[PDB]
Design a protein around this ligand. Sequence first.
Ligand code: HEM
Ligand code: HEM
Ligand code: 0GD
Ligand code: 0GD
Ligand code: H4B
Ligand code: H4B
Ligand code: CL
Ligand code: CL
Lengths: 362, 362
Amino acid sequence: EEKEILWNEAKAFIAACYQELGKAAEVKDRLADIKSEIDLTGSYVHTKEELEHGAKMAWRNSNRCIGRLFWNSLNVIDRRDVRTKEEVRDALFHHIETATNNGKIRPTITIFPPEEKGEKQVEIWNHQLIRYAGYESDGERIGDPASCSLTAACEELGWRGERTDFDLLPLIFRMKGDEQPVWYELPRSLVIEVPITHPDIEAFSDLELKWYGVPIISDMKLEVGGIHYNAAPFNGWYMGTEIGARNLADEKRYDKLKKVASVIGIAADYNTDLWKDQALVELNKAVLHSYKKQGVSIVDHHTAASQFKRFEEQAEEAGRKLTGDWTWLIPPISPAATHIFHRSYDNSIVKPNYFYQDKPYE
Amino acid sequence: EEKEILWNEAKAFIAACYQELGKAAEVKDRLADIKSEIDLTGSYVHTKEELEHGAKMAWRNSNRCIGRLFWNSLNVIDRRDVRTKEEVRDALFHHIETATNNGKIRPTITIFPPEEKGEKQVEIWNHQLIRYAGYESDGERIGDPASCSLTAACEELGWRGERTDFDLLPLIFRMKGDEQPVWYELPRSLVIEVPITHPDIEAFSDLELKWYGVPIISDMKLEVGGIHYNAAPFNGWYMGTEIGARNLADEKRYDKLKKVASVIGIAADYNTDLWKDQALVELNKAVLHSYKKQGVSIVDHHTAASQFKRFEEQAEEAGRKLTGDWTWLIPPISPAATHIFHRSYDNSIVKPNYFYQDKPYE
Ligand code: HEM
Ligand code: HEM
Ligand SMILES: Cc1cc(N)nc(-c2ccc(CNCCc3cccc(F)c3)cc2)c1
Ligand SMILES: Cc1cc(N)nc(-c2ccc(CNCCc3cccc(F)c3)cc2)c1
Ligand SMILES: C[C@H](O)[C@H](O)[C@H]1CNc2nc(N)[nH]c(=O)c2N1
Ligand SMILES: C[C@H](O)[C@H](O)[C@H]1CNc2nc(N)[nH]c(=O)c2N1
Ligand SMILES: [Cl-]
Ligand SMILES: [Cl-]
């Protein structure tokens, strides 16, 4: 049954992949090879070409992602050769370094060995490779609430956070055959952070806000032709709203809107004053300004939506159906100022793709 | 077949209606009466109690409406007795007067005779009872683009607009048995309008913006227990974003964001400056300020969302399933600042309800 799922997925992927690569004539023989390989081993191994194009197709098919125009320029690093925790750690360090690229962020994915019998070879615990710790105890809240459960798990492994609002979590992952994950502190020289200042309002720096440069999602599964790459961290650059409208603004995250209102000199007393809306706009302006000033890549939601429009056009020109999740594609600030708000999207799931998977802790 | 649809809908409605009204014991005899009445006449007539509660249930079931907390205080005016165009006109004038209530807006619905064989008795052409005309010809655009087709239809009936940006469309409706609709100019004394000024920025008045006080939707069908009330205009007060984030801001509406940016003294040159977002916030502040200053009811999106939360709670307490359309319930400005953004809603259709219907022109 599982083999059949594998073979059916493989047939669909190879046909589509080789079509797009102008290799349609090679489909027949390649499928035969794979079919034999499944029969004998219970699985099959992707060529480097298949793996690279598969990761790109998976991004192209990610319904919730506004950044998909650039799917074909994804930098794919094949690390299916890793066998040791030192190799995994060094690969993750390298990913951070090469993706960061001194601020000129390169969209990158590092692909580790795939699941075998649904058995993971490498199990990454981090949500993102760079993320802040969170703490809550007897009433006191410190750091990023979204990291509370992982932070607590880490402190079960012998790690201890300094309990600033911006402690960098260590890398945490488990190797097949080990009962507990290992953790490694991030070399600070690898991690770019951006202090948040405002172009016009000098007092904004009093909030002492910062965010990290590069979002590197490390807890999703890349599925390509029936092969499950549960460990395959990927990154892009931020859209400013992710930081200014959500990470720093959500009541269940850093919850900074009242403090923002104060430093920009407006009252936070009356709903009809739209002080939350004004604070959100200024915080989002500050985020974009700060990343730009520091030479770290970022995109604003207007430019991002314009690029997404081009992605829609390119899909139509290539004769590919477009899929999207409207509820995630609209930016959380001024959504109706984008073309996305005013059309609809088919939210069908197409593979290859990136999927959520169960967490190994909690 | 149609009778069966009618009888099935009637059974569902009467049972539910009488339950909610504590009249469950009367359901049996009432259903018998209706069943006979359908047999003989092909239809049935609602009691005043049924009609009133039906209109209220229909609002309660309107998935796209954030304002539903107040469903049970809807003022229902029964005008099933009208037979002449003079009576219709006067009823519509009266609706405007009593709903407006000198600025302290009363949510009101006026219900006209229902369709018989799918044959309308009264056919209202207006989208809203008070709405601005729109014009486009050899390149020149005047007024509200969304009203262009109705405006053109009106000018086929002997009416002529002054071609300001805010011409009030006349009431336009057709009686059963007449081939053409009639039109009547709105008495200006009945129509409250609000000039848009800003609490802090004196130059905002240079834009010479205004909007009308009361949104009165006049082109939707109220369906209650299988009876189709195609003519049943209803009103509430505005949520500020409808005016400031959409009517005045949409590129395909009044398209005022660039002019707003200019009068508030910011550049409209760079996406990363978030000038559209800032302009939207100031325009929305001005809308709320202006309606408040003039003593015309309005609600901001934060307060409206808070009321909607109470509506959700009240549904749960009453043991009623909640339905909603997330994509319409989120406000078009700072949606993630509302609780609505962070939950999901079942978009199932429950009757009684209000529905779109085909336009009689174009
Ligand atoms: C290059 C710059 C990129 C930008 C600006 C961008 C933008 C975004 C944004 C704003 C989200 C929504 C996240 C949230 O609200 O939680 C998102 C989701 C997503 N992006 Fe992208 N993205 C980029 C690159 C990539 C890359 C390189 C991949 C993978 C190869 C990717 C795959 C996804 C996926 C899978 C999601 C969905 C996450 C989820 O369901 O929680 N994106 N993207
Ligand atoms: C009392 C104040 C009210 C407020 C603030 C309010 C708010 C809103 C808003 C903002 C919308 C979205 C409109 C759009 O974006 O196009 C809406 C939709 C709707 N409202 Fe309400 N509403 C109110 C009263 C009412 C009343 C009295 C009824 C009927 C009895 C009603 C029925 C609806 C319906 C049917 C829609 C959907 C319109 C469509 O699908 O195009 N509302 N409401
Ligand atoms: C590659 C990339 C670029 C970019 N600019 N953003 C992202 C990105 C950001 C955040 C997320 C996380 N989305 C939410 C996951 C989630 C889902 C449900 C509950 C939760 F607490 C968290 C995924 C991708 C990814
Ligand atoms: C009662 C009430 C109160 C309030 N504050 N707003 C409304 C209201 C406002 C606008 C609308 C119109 N919604 C869009 C109709 C539509 C749908 C599709 C295309 C179009 F051009 C227009 C409906 C109800 C209704
Ligand atoms: C295409 C999309 O459904 C459309 O733009 C909707 C989105 N959500 C909305 N929500 C409201 N309240 N009003 C609208 O006009 C719309 N437009
Ligand atoms: C409940 C709802 O689905 C949830 O709040 C979603 C809405 N749309 C979103 N869109 C993005 N981009 N990111 C998010 O976290 C969410 N949250
Ligand atoms: Cl993030
Ligand atoms: Cl409107």
